[model samples]
Target: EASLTGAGATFPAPVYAKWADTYQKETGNKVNYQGIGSSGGVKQIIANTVDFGASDAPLSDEKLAQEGLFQFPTVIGGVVLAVNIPGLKSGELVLDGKTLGDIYLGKIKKWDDEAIAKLNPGLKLPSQNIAVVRRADGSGDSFVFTSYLAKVNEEWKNNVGTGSTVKWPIGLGGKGNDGIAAFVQRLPGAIGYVEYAYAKQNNLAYTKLISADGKPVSPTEENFANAAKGADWSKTFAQDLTNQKGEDAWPITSTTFILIHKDQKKPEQGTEVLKFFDWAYKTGAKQANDLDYASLPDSVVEQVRAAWKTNIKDSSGKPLY
Candidate 1:
């Protein structure tokens, strides 16, 4: 029996690691995943070096076609504007998309900038210079953060745009979600974006984002799930779930995805990969919730299964799933 290998997004690394360990024990089929960041994961899959790749930044239909790959959503999580200001508690700080964008753009250099002060009226604001921490590696974390920024700020859309890697107008660099969380925890008056789990795990203070409906929303499973409620999964699976208009919706919600070749190089390995995910979708919800990740809705899971049947097949034209 052969093992399955996957790599990519550190955003979902904890849950993937958990699933891999448990799945290995149950099925006796080893699954190894490397949290090398999303861009590296894409490269490895394109190079045919791994059985699968994971990313929060979904690939375009053209790119998928060009690479002869199929992609599907795995789970939903959120990007938190995690911060470290002296005496600030998690969720005490509030930041809208534009203010947050400006902070990352380096225009709002200090923690007590007028833009941020406007959001937090009575809170004791710090005068320390903002230590912006960003992903040094090619990362889906950067992609989701920039995607929301682009939607909210015209200058950010025109200048920085959205990608797995973007040239930050200013900031120090951390390698992944965990790296950024650590940097934010260590540096006073620092601001960094990380997955919700990382923010909670590190006990770093996080900001409530202003939702599209003009409500300040904290990152919670219900908020994240509400943000994704309007996702139109009718066409491609890479639908954006950010900035949704709901009082309880977290603005920066995103779904991490899985990628594999349309035609399997080795059907046995492919079969094993599908089985692992099927198991995850069916039974991994508790673990996903334990890490603050929302498992896919049944409707979305059904669509993904249909795509697997229709697109992912063996060289002999047999469906792997």
Candidate 2:
């Protein structure tokens, strides 16, 4: 049995942990993962510190080239708008792009702000102050959520474009997805965005997002796959897949990645990591749905395996496995 280690992107931590548990039992190899935020994952992969790194935000081509690391989508998921308003119900809150962006930028202060009311029309929103909760650490969830805002709002694009971390105009910052969820749960009138699994697991009131096609959509596998349609695989070989097109797309749908180096200090460990992924793709896909995540499409999986064959090599320039 071989041992492997990985770190990054708490957005998919629960599922990754589940995969690790079952994988070890089935294959007799240990896969260790640390739930570090995305930025930390990127930093560690670039530093060649771990067997592999994971991130919700795809690494830019420039970053990949600089680090000599290879990345591929391991799973797909969506970020949900979680809130702590007193009277709101799950999937009851409807938010369009602009007003949601305004809330993050500290422009909309009250739960019943005029901009928000216009979207809901008849729903009774409270007059209580809105407290925005955001990620204090650099996170891919922040990037995905903010990127959606930038896509839908001209002002947000100009002033607060998408990123792994952003300057908040108000409220508080939590360390990670769990931290933000916990903070929002405790603070009344609080609102934040996190992966769909987190909202479901915490039983937080999650807002339904109005898609570009004007449909109020919930975070579901079908919706996320709709977002992934026509994604350019060519761009992915260079490690970028940020912009894609589909009508039912959640806009915030993100595919978390696992990053591995071409040269590893322990090649056997790298092979073990690849085996764990192979097992997960072949056997543990159903577990993904249980966690509110989408399995990697078969086409994507084949392409990723091809990429791994080309990129996951040893110092002798041979494929690790």
Candidate 3:
């Protein structure tokens, strides 16, 4: 019966919009969410500007403790390398971790460079100048992609490192996922990183990234799941979730979270928010597949529910959910 408002992370905007539409239709309760990027979402949550905040990057435990906020992972997705090379077919390109970093760092200036060619033996890469596109705004997508780069490339770690914000070595800044994808689509030889669904929806050519074990893997739900394998949720209480390590894991796979205050001013509104999540877990899992998102496993969902029970509270110190 209460209207709920949330803001954060454009990375999951499409699917969240779908959920909001279906939720309102089914329950007759309105839900509005803003597709502001991750950094803004964190700030909004800390400032108590919304009922909840969504971010592709999880809040560190220290920050959560400081702010008296709680976070829970809602979905998993992959950050993909998208390009607008004229002759390249969709999914025809393959790139290893270091080479991909080099491209972003301006070390690999042209498409036909040996580093790129070595990964795609038979494909014809252009000799034209490569135009790199990157997120101009602070973003969790940047954190995921750059963290993976830092993990594999010493130069990236030492010189150009990873975080929610990074010092982009060379590239034009696009505001969000859509902006980057659009910019890449218009520029020949342009390359950028965006969520996997954006690449698929835009029909952009996306590369299969080399896994930690030296095998090429596409940015599929299964591949993202592999990357999530063996992730200790306990370790997640304080650290960055983007830098997960697994052999089959798509290095750029990331978890997005919804942040809620420990004490909701309107308890009923908070309950409705949890109800929406409950409905999604119970009935919207199928929808995730259509959007190329990996739904949380039942076990993880249960853990998240328990977390909501423990963390989301009212002024009376009662659990909101």
Candidate numbers, best TM-score first, in rank order: 1, 3, 2
Q: Tens digit of lDDT per residue, candidate 2, span 1-321?
A: 887778899999999999999988887888889988999998887777777888888877677777777777888888888899888898888898878888877888899988988888878999989989899999998888877888777778988787898766676888889998999899999998888889989989898878777778776778877777767665563222223455777767888888887776677888888888888899888899889787767887898888788888877888975
What TM-score does structure 2 among the candidates reach? Answer: 0.95
Write the residue-wise lDDT of candidate 1 on 20-112 in tens digits: 988987888899999999999999999989999988899999999999999999889999988889978889998998988888888889888
TM-score of 1: 0.98
Ranking by lDDT: 1, 3, 2
User: Which ranges of candidate 1 are over 4 A from the true structure?
Assistant: none
Give me candidate 3's TM-score against the actual structure: 0.96
Off by over 4 Å in 3: 234-248
Best by TM-score: 1
lDDT of 1 at 245: 84
lDDT of 2 at 106: 81
lDDT of 3 by residue, 54-111 (tens): 8888777788888888888877889998999888888889988889889888999999
Cα-based RMSD of candidate 3: 1.6
Which regions in candidate 2 have their CA more than 4 angstroms from the true location? Answer: 234-247
